[PDB]
Amino acid sequence: ELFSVVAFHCPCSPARNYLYGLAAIGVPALVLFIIGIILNNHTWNLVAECQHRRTKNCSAAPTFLLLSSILGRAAVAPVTWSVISLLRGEAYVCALSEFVDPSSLTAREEHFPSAHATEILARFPCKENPDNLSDFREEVSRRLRYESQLFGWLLIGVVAILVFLTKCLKHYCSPLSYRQEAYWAQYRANEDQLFQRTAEVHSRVLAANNVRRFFGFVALNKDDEELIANFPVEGTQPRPQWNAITGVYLYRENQGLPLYSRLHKWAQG
Amino acid sequence: LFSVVAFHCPCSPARNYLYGLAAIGVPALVLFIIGIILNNHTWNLVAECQHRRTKNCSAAPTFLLLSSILGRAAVAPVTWSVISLLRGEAYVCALSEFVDPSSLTAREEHFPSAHATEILARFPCKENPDNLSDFREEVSRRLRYESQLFGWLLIGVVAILVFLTKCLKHYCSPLSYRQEAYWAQYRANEDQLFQRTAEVHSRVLAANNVRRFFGFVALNKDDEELIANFPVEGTQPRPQWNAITGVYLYRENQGLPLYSRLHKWAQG
Amino acid sequence: LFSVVAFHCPCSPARNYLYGLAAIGVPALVLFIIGIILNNHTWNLVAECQHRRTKNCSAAPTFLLLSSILGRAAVAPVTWSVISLLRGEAYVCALSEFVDPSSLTAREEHFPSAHATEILARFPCKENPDNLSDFREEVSRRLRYESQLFGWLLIGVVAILVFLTKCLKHYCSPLSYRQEAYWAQYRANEDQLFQRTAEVHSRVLAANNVRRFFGFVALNKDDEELIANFPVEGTQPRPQWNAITGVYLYRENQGLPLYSRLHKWAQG
Amino acid sequence: ELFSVVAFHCPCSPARNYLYGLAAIGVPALVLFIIGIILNNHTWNLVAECQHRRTKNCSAAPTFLLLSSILGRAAVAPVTWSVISLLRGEAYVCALSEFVDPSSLTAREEHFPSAHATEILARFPCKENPDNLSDFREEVSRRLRYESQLFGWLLIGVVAILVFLTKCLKHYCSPLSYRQEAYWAQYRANEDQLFQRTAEVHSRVLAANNVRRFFGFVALNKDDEELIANFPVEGTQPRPQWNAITGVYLYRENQGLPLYSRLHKWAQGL
Amino acid sequence: SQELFSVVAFHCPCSPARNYLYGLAAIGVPALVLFIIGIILNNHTWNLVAECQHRRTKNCSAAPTFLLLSSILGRAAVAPVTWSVISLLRGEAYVCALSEFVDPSSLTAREEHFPSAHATEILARFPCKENPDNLSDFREEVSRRLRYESQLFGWLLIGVVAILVFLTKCLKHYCSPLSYRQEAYWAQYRANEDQLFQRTAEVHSRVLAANNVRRFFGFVALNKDDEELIANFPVEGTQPRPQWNAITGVYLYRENQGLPLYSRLHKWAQGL
Amino acid sequence: ELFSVVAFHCPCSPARNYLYGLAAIGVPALVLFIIGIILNNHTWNLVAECQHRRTKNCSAAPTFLLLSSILGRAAVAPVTWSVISLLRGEAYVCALSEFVDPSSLTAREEHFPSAHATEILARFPCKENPDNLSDFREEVSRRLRYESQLFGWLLIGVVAILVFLTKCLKHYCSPLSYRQEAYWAQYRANEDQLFQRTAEVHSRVLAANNVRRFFGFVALNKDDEELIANFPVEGTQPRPQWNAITGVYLYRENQGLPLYSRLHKWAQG
Amino acid sequence: KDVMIFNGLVALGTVGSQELFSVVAFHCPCSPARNYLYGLAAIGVPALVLFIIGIILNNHTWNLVAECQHRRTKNCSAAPTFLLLSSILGRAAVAPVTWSVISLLRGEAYVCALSEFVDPSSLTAREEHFPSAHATEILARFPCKENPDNLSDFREEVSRRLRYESQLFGWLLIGVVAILVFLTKCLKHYCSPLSYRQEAYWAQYRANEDQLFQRTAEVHSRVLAANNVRRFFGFVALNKDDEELIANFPVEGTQPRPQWNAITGVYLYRENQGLPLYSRLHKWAQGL
């Protein structure tokens, strides 16, 4: 059971668990955050922009709109994991168990020992406390869980406000009516489907034309014969030609009619 | 799961009413913010503030539409505020510390006055002495009454508002209601066909660009008719897009009504 | 689900009787509203004042229509109020504090006179000493009788009201029921095919507008014949639309009975 | 119950379990690491590269860019086993229970004996501890499990950075845009799967061409009869021809056009 | 089968100088039986035998035999190892074997309460639980050290094999004159030829059986599918023993005119 | 059930149970050995071969290898039953219970009575022993059961080697390459299946003619008429011709071509 | 084959019946010189009876009698008698043997038998304690399991030693029948004039002819009866199948009485001038 593997087990110890809780929640967020950048294609072409120029010709301000998109899109993974842990509250209570002031404790009279304070409070999350302090143990358990949930509900509130400000300003300051942007956002996600689809077909066709010249024939299934028959290949596309359809693109217009993707710009020569 | 969003009452003085505010206000706020974004009637309104850059249009025409934005998006917070009030757990945890010890009933003068607020704080969590359980049960019902009381009357004031808004809407709209019904069926019919054509006119332009690169575009059996039946030569000008976005209030043309800016653009 | 919509008595004097009114009347009140909104007869009756703004129609001709509208929507208030009265939950919670202790019998005088109302208020919540269980039981059984007695005669009131009105409606109306059955069927049938024609005529105009913008419209197979079958040129003017909505009471034209304003408009 | 056999059994004995901790975690890691190298086709054409030249003229500049890929595509398997063990915590606690400082125990007063501290601490993972020290064990067990679970999470972080570091350099230092590399990635697999598929068929046709000469006829299934009727062969492929499509290929452009596989380089006749 | 498993299951005889004999038999012999099965099923061992039979002069040197002999054991020594390893990891076999060899003074967890009257006898009784209750702590102590010593060796044995397999695989590719890719085709050819051979041998067997029965009974009875076999695959006679004698024997890549021959049969198909 | 009846029941009695153990093991082995000989077809033509010559015309040496095949094929059942009994150990303990030397007994101080050594040692397997010597009954049982399992494992080992030894020499000493034996074996199995299949068809057709000749007709199922029409009988086959295709057969060549059975030799004319 | 399954069901049938018999109805009469006779009858009587239904139900048995009564000279050759006698026993005499062995194997049948013969002085593990007058009587009560606990010690050894004898005796019986079957099969093939392939073909033919004979005979009865119905009514009503038979099977008539007698009895296996004849029925057709 992988649930038992990644389960949050609180090491009840002073000055030790908050260090653990920091690395038991932040690190999965870091992994989740890293995944978002890696998979999002909007960051490779941004990287690819930095490699071809080798000079830093392009200004930062035009690229900041796209730079905020990769971080923004990938920011769901940390938030949806930072929030879920906070609401569960197990992460926080084990983290902040040892900072509770014994003097400010409530629900009971001043019978809390002060010989070794942090040691007893640190052991609260694991329930390894004498029942004579069970009221104290429960009181801190509830109060600390309260701050987690209050922080958790605050966290989701802040994200919602940020999204509202982001989308409202993005539509306001963009120079295209939002209906056109929907068509544009229905293009880049449509071109990439066709471009990936023909990438294999013009690869497999080029694969068969290589094996055949070696073996003397090519094994194929019933469908693959249609690929060779319908779509013949003659050669390969030049490397600079590949260089002209990678990078970032920001609504460069031609003659008064838009070009929606950098490939479309190259399709006009 | 429901366990994560489940209401856990922190039985503490001057603290739980903060939590109830957050555990109810924020989910209400997050629903309301969701409502605005999804409702497409606000973006063109936002886009309306952009193209003019002058505010030529007065607020009076906008106000009739602006109500339809917040109101149509206010259903989600209301149905979430109601259930929380009807459930009652949030309210009792909210006002437990404000119960007057003097107004306590169903028992003799046995409730301690040493730390009333502290004792009153721990009522929602069953952290109470059995001797005070009668007091706890009394406030467990008196407080739950107010929540269920507030829930029902807040439902009623909402309910009459729907009737008041709808009747006034039919009272103030110059066109007859049955014609408005046709207008409602036209907005859905145009939006679907426009959206359905948005994908197709995107795909045809998509294939007409990949082909220039690879030399051929791989299409399945059904997408093949898309290229054959629907050929395009280019794109549409930005001003042309800029003339069919925004708000529209029943501009009549030579005795012929127009129902959408696109229709108004279709008449030239 | 059903847990949220339930009755829980606040065992408090001068407070529970408010809850009983709120916990039943308001759910009945909203159900009363809902019937009005769904019915289409209200808006045209509402729209009648809009097209005149002068009170052209007198009170006597228009008073006849008002009777039918309220009764149709009155189904929800009566289909719910009597059900709660059958359970008797509202009555026992509401008027328990107002039960006169003098009429209490079938037991010796044991109920305290210090707080008679307060003890009475806590009966529904099962909070009562076993010595007063007899006092609780007698009133609980008495209130359940009165609630059911009240609830049962409500059904009879409904039963007689529909019966007398139906013959009165037949007697008052100058039309035979066989004539009324056909006429009523016409409205219930002409509306349905009016709505279906509305969408088809809505889509056809919608398709034409998009084509003038994109250049081609992506329709399914069934929509393809829609363009071929029903091609339109423009729309219908607002006065033509206005001549449809409103109320109508069986005008006659040279011995030809007309059954709808549309039929009245059909002859020109 | 095959998983039950490989289950961890901590030998509670001083200076002994950490050896077992190593050899019951390292060895399956070593086995998983070796498997990654063996099954990875990119490691054989590396070996066959230095084999046929017999001189090692080529420098380390082209080798290191591939050698990392050999381990990288294979070193993931040991790590996803090394991290899993650390998260479970069983491997570490038994390994290091001997080294716990007898002066660093808390949650109890000075009740730890000093006669054989290492010995008594060694038996903590086996729960064979007298009930007068049950507080001590539940302190050491939970403390050591922290150290493991901290190391496991940290190790995941280091891979979570090395992958992102590598994926950036592999796209910033390579002379090809990523969209072209995806094609070059979609071509290496497209050719190899065709090659394996066509190798099997040209094997069977050659086989059926010899068995016939030994029996006068060949038994073939109904669908296999189509194979012989479609893909006739005339002989075998010479060894030097088989020796020019084995090895490492590094983006040799031809007359201004690219070649994506070493086979492709031979396909143009080079 | 719960009864069959119960028969083979280990039953340690707690007695000195006796159990490790059984432990040797209870693991060694099933390993030996598995190893013998590995030899017989390995088709490469027979044409190896047939090679040592037909030539009668030991024509082949050590190098042609050594390269093949490695494949004989490698494809067969897997079965003993995965049985020896599985036994060691279980640890029951080892603890029964060495229960009479731990040094009493090396024991711990208890003071010098270990009797020295007949040390070997009492130690040997540990695996079968047949121990006095006062030495139950010692019983568990030895029951764990010996489990360890088995388990460490069990894991160590797997590691050594996982090195030899990698070393053997790497050496073969570096030493053979063929490219690794051409060997894959060569491996993909022996399987196709063998499967076609065995399948087509049956058909040329049944036809000969059908032809001979017809001469005796006067006719032959065939199933629906066998009817096609007689017409589609007619035979005229048998094949001489020397013809059968040119295709059974180890073959190591004799190239012809610069074009390879991939098996004895292929060399015969060219009449060489 | 059947297993309950044939369940071993050790007769605890001196000088008597080892007789029972032999019969309760040997007889099941002897019976199973007979079934191996009886069902095997290569044993009857061996006997039938002696019928025709009646004078030992053929030498015993060439026919010896067949005798190696008949014993080897049949011996699987006795061994697989002898081994199972040895591994179970029930047979052996009751067989040798009363032969355990009291002097060599261990795991107990010398309380073993000598008044009836054999008798009390005979009763050990059947729980009819004093509880004061219960540890001995466990000690003697475990040592004896150890001896049984060692013999069982040694026996299966020797059978394992002999199977290999008789299969390494058979290929070596046979005059044919092992592949020819593959065809020869696949031919024999094909011949017998086809030969037996035609016998049913030939008989059913022949019986039809006799019944038709005597009722004037025959009652047939759906496929019988197909059998009658497709395969008509023209008579029977002489006995001496049948005799030429019975009996053992060694590989004999004709004009440089093999003949794989007497039926083949007969079919060649 | 078909023969083995036919025997197997019978072997299972008696074993189950023996298990059923040993539960509901077997109570050893613990009375001297009464259990001994009871024990012997508890084995032989089912054995002798079960052998009898084996003979009666065997069709080939009356074939032997028919020839013996017809020939009155025992002119049947040794080989056909070897075939039939080894056929009936192999098909019938199996059932008593299986009952006999399982009865011995369980031992409750035998333990009653020699309980009388048990020597009081042959007992061990203690001094012999039995009166010279009631020694036989007390032993007879051992199998009932009602013996006093004082005599339980001596009873278990006696009830087991006989149980030892029964299982050993039952096993020894299995050896004899197993050897005999092996001995007979060799004698059957050695003394037969034709090889086993001939014997296989012949016995395989015998089943097919008699199976064909039975099916035809039932049909011939129906068609002959139907034709006489037509003669007695002038019309016949038939279903789909039977009506096809009358149109497809002409009525040859009534066969001569000697012809029926010629096709019953033992088979002389006289080769028709070298051409084999596998039954009397085959000879009759080839004879004419």
Numbering used by the authors:
A (entry chain G), F (entry chain D): 37 to 305
B (entry chain H), C (entry chain I): 38 to 305
D (entry chain F): 37 to 306
E (entry chain E): 35 to 306
G (entry chain C): 19 to 306
Sentences copied from the publication:
The calcium homeostasis modulators (CALHM) constitute one family of large pore channels that contains six members in humans. Although sharing the same number of membrane-spanning segments, their arrangement is unique and differs from other large pore channels, with an extended helix located on the C-terminus and forming the core of a cytoplasmic domain further mediating subunit interactions. In oligomeric channels, the pore is lined by the first transmembrane segment (TM1) of each subunit, which forms an inner, of two concentric rings, with the outer ring being constituted by TM2-4, with TM2 and 4 of neighboring subunits engaging in extended interactions. Here, we investigated whether these placental paralogs would form heteromers and characterized heteromeric complexes consisting of CALHM2 and CALHM4 subunits using specific binders as fiducial markers.
We have then added sybodies in stoichiometric excess and determined two datasets of CALHM2/4-sybody complexes, one containing both binders and a second SbC4 only. In both datasets, the position of CALHM4 subunits is marked by the binding of SbC4 to the extracellular part of the protein, whereas in the dataset containing both sybodies, SbC2 additionally labels CALHM2 subunits. Although our 3D classification has defined a broad distribution of different heteromeric assemblies of CALHM2/4 channels, the population in each distinct assembly is too small to reach high-resolution. We have thus pooled the classes of all undecameric channels containing two to four copies of CALHM4, and proceeded with further map refinement, which has allowed us to obtain maps extending to global resolutions of 3.8 Å and 3.3 Å for the datasets of samples containing either SbC4 only (CALHM2/4/SbC4), or both SbC2 and SbC4 (CALHM2/4/SbC2/SbC4), respectively. The two cryo-EM densities provide congruent views of the relative arrangement and conformational preferences of CALHM2 and CALHM4 subunits in heteromeric channels. In both datasets, the two positions uniformly occupied by CALHM4 (referred to as 1 and 2 when numbered in a counterclockwise direction from the extracellular side) are well-defined and clearly discernable by SbC4 bound to its extracellular epitope. Similarly, the seven following positions (3-9), occupied by CALHM2, are well defined, whereas the two positions adjacent to the two CALHM4 subunits in a clockwise direction (11 and 10), which contain CALHM2 or 4 at different ratios are of somewhat lower resolution due to the averaging of two different subunits. Whereas in CALHM2/4 heteromers, the CALHM4 subunits reside in the preferential ‘down’ conformation observed in homomeric channels, irrespective of their relative position in the channel, the conformational properties of CALHM2 subunits are influenced by their environment.
